[PDB]
Design an enzyme around this catalytic site. Structure first.
Site, mmCIF file in Angstrom:
data_model
loop_
_atom_site.group_PDB
_atom_site.id
_atom_site.type_symbol
_atom_site.label_atom_id
_atom_site.label_comp_id
_atom_site.label_asym_id
_atom_site.label_seq_id
_atom_site.Cartn_x
_atom_site.Cartn_y
_atom_site.Cartn_z
ATOM 1 C CB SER A 284 -0.950 -0.016 1.188
ATOM 2 O OG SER A 284 -1.914 1.030 1.103
ATOM 3 C CE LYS B 120 5.878 -2.244 2.597
ATOM 4 N NZ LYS B 120 6.068 -3.538 1.900
ATOM 5 C CG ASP C 218 11.346 -8.003 -4.541
ATOM 6 O OD1 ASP C 218 10.950 -8.163 -3.375
ATOM 7 O OD2 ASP C 218 11.103 -8.804 -5.472
HETATM 8 C C1 LIG Z 1 8.057 1.705 -2.065
HETATM 9 C C2 LIG Z 1 8.841 0.487 -1.681
HETATM 10 C C3 LIG Z 1 9.478 -0.263 -2.686
HETATM 11 C C4 LIG Z 1 10.226 -1.396 -2.343
HETATM 12 C C5 LIG Z 1 10.332 -1.790 -1.013
HETATM 13 C C6 LIG Z 1 11.037 -3.083 -0.660
HETATM 14 N N1 LIG Z 1 10.744 -3.667 0.559
HETATM 15 O O1 LIG Z 1 11.819 -3.652 -1.416
HETATM 16 C C7 LIG Z 1 9.706 -1.040 -0.008
HETATM 17 C C8 LIG Z 1 8.959 0.091 -0.346
HETATM 18 MG MG LIG Z 2 9.812 -10.278 -5.964
#
Ligand SMILES: Cc1ccc(C(N)=O)cc1
Ligand SMILES: [Mg+2]
Ligand SMILES: [Cl-]
Ligand SMILES: [Cl-]
Ligand SMILES: [Cl-]
Ligand SMILES: [Cl-]
EC number: 2.7.11.24
Length: 348
Positions: free
Chosen positions: A33, A49, A164
């Site tokens: 989100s 997020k 990611d």
């Molecule tokens: C906006 C967002 C994009 C990637 C990640 C992640 N955990 O790799 C976290 C937040």
């Molecule tokens: Mg993935």
């Protein structure tokens, strides 16, 4: 403690510090989100997020902790990092929501690989930046496991970052059929041949480099077995030495049912490409993962002569992941997550 304010977004009430202005939804929900915002403290456009009630189960509570540890660790120009983390809770007892603030990277490699003319000089700089990031990630003993064009953010200047970290393990349904999520996977992980390691990520870099050079997916299989056949036609069937390293007896029997095939000539597959790009592709796309080129060795390859600077290819601080083998209760994972939130120190 900053002052917080409330507003209605993505079907819940968001409560964020005043520094974050002009919030509005962004993306398709791949990474959770997410809203875009203007950060008045840094001047950056940012992604915020919201993880709402994420201490709902042992699996989810451990995942929350994992994502926060990984994002707090990553401090590199070619990797996603943590600008901020916050909760509106004043104590552990009322802690329920986690918000993560990361750089807003609008476009990915998918939005330029198909709609743009990439020169050899473009391919050199993009793959250079992926390997610089990977050298850093691998020096911390972190395996990415999901490198693919949708996980690479790119700006108008062709500057790249890797996304990611610490999200849910991809399901069996997500990996079924004619899907981008499987096309970049090393064969030893796609079919569970053996205990895999960081060499899986170099296979993925090979598949990405091929696609930038040709404009086409290298191994677009319609299922796991169709994809394996496309792979073995290019790189050859396994020899005796690799067959010994495949732990599953069933996988070994299946492999030995296939008619033997030699490795193809990559100069006749990648027709017209820079001969230095052909040579590097041959060193990444090796079936035996023990024999693939490392990120650190690939940065010193002649293909990257005009970018390589051995005084500007940094390594990572050590990364303690002993928590990965620890068994805790939900409230214990939640308390470790709260400590990581309140201990956060922002970058320069
Ligand atoms: C906006 C967002 C994009 C990637 C990640 C992640 N955990 O790799 C976290 C937040
Ligand atoms: Mg993935
Ligand atoms: Cl504020
Ligand atoms: Cl909360
Ligand atoms: Cl993709
Ligand atoms: Cl650590």
């Amino acid at each position: 403690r900053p002052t917080f304010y409330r507003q209605e977004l993505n079907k819940t009430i968001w409560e964020v510090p005043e520094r974050y202005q002009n919030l509005s939804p962004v993306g398709s929900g791949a990474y959770g989100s997410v809203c875009a915002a203007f950060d008045t403290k840094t001047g950056h456009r940012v992604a915020v997020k919201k993880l709402s009630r994420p201490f709902q189960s042992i699996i989810h509570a451990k995942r929350t902790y994992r994502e926060l540890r990984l994002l707090k660790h990553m401090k590199h120009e070619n990797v996603i990092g943590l600008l901020d983390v916050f909760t509106p809770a004043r104590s552990l007892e009322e802690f329920n929501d986690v918000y993560l603030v990361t750089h807003l990277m609008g476009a990915d490699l998918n939005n330029i690989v198909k709609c743009q003319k990439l020169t050899d000089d473009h391919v050199q700089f993009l793959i250079y930046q992926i390997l610089r990031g990977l050298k850093y990630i691998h020096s911390a003993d972190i395996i990415h496991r999901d490198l693919k064009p949708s996980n690479l953010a790119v700006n108008e200047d062709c500057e790249l970052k890797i996304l990611d970290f610490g999200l849910a393990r991809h399901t069996d349904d997500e990996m079924t059929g004619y899907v981008a999520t499987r096309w970049y996977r090393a064969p030893e992980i796609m079919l569970n041949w053996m205990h895999y390691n960081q060499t899986v990520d170099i296979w993925s870099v090979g598949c990405i480099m091929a696609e930038l050079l040709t404009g086409r997916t290298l191994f677009p299989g319609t299922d796991h077995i169709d994809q394996l056949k496309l792979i073995l036609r290019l790189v050859g069937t396994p020899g005796a030495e690799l067959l010994k390293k495949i732990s599953s007896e069933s996988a070994r029997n299946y492999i030995q049912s296939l008619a033997q095939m030699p490795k193809m000539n990559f100069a006749n597959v990648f027709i017209g490409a820079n001969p230095l790009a052909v040579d590097l592709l041959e060193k990444m796309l090796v079936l035996d993962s023990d024999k693939r080129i490392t990120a650190a060795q690939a940065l010193a390859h002649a293909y990257f002569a005009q970018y390589h600077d051995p005084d500007d290819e940094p390594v990572a601080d050590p990364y303690d992941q002993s928590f990965e083998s620890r068994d805790l209760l939900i409230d214990e994972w939640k308390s470790l997550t709260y400590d990581e939130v309140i201990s956060f120190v922002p970058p320069p």
